[PDB]
Q: What sequence folds into this?
């Protein structure tokens, strides 16, 4: 179906995260406990937001790199629907996270970082993982060159493997067209979805989403 | 001369506090492992900082992105050393090193993923001189102990001027394997706690004296 709107909560305290989530809930589909909030407060953040927003999809972004069986279980038990696992995790860790996700009826999302390869992506799909978080290339962000042909190509390759991407990195309404035809689960933003104009930004994103999906 | 480090990977702070208290007189470095960090948040770092004011304290975040903010949070909480994933973009690693410099702390690179010796040279060029080297997960899966592909990579890293922290089923009888490798710490978990932890620490100390400096 069409791409959903996801807010990444990266506040350094739970009181502020709870305030934001409360303010944005009526117009976001997915609420994410970002890695910053997760380290600031621990699994209490997940449980709290789970209780506050029971009808939202809830993500715990741990970028799990090792101890996957234990971390996956903790996050799922706390109430996460989806959790993130670093692409740099050993494939056995990734499998362990997946085993826990299947036990607990959650899902794994691969956070794409490091010297990752399409061989690696194929191994994720072979474990039955069908979600990845694709960040605008950092080199491109630093250089100011936007979303490059190479990033879009890589996203197309992943989509062709059956991976449903969450796309993130300076996402704004006027760039949505770029992702036409990419298998996209969500668009993820942070501050753009909060505050005075977050509601109108969400609506501007949805308008663009509806043109292309 | 290598120091002895305990990795606290308990899933609650009560248990970690009890373990830290039990082992503190024979370990040099106390580490808030990623598991405990995600379970409890930064209060784990600040609690252990308080309880053990003279130890070197590590916050094992395996930071992959949002490094300036995460690094600050950990150092503010009382960490002396923090870990950053090899999969972090070099700009993130640079951002963590900048905060570490500003807050008189240190960065350690957690070696995961498809990392390269070019990456390692980039870490050294930022002034980073520590990395965490884990016994190959494939070696563990096969049950075969340490292999020369790991030892050789550690010797290459040492030759670039990185002081390794070595972990993965470390036992006293294996310490001889690492002779000649610049080593900051040996890290273990359950082996350093409980009934036999003290005696194991003793043996590890004696083996360390036999091969360093
Ligand atoms: Mg995230
Ligand atoms: Mg058209
Ligand atoms: Mg560790
Ligand atoms: Mg006191």
A:
């Amino acid at each position: 179906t069409k791409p959903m709107i996801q807010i990444a909560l990266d506040q350094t305290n739970l009181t502020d995260a709870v305030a934001v989530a409360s303010n944005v809930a009526s117009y976001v589909d997915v609420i994410e406990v970002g890695t910053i909030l997760a380290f600031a407060e621990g699994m209490k953040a997940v449980s709290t937001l789970r209780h506050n927003h029971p009808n939202h999809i809830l993500v715990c972004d741990m970028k799990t790199t090792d101890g996957g069986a234990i971390l996956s279980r903790m996050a799922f038990e706390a109430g996460a629907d989806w959790i993130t696992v670093s692409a740099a995790a050993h494939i056995a860790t990734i499998a362990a996270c997946k085993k826990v996700a299947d036990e607990l009826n959650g899902e794994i999302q691969i956070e794409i970082y490091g010297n990752w390869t399409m061989q690696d992506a194929k191994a994720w799909v072979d474990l039955g993982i069908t979600q990845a978080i694709y960040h605008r290339s950092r080199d491109a962000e630093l250089a100011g060159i936007g979303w490059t042909t190479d990033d879009l190509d890589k996203m197309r390759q992943l989509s062709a493997l059956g991976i449903e991407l969450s796309i993130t990195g300076g996402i704004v309404p006027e760039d949505i067209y770029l992702f036409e035809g990419i298998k996209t689960k969500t668009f993820i933003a942070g501050r753009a979805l909060a505050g005075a104009e977050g509601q109108q930004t969400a609506a501007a994103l949805r308008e663009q989403i509806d043109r292309f999906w």
User: Anything to note?
Assistant: Chain A is about 45% helix and 20% strand. The radius of gyration of chain A is 16 Å.
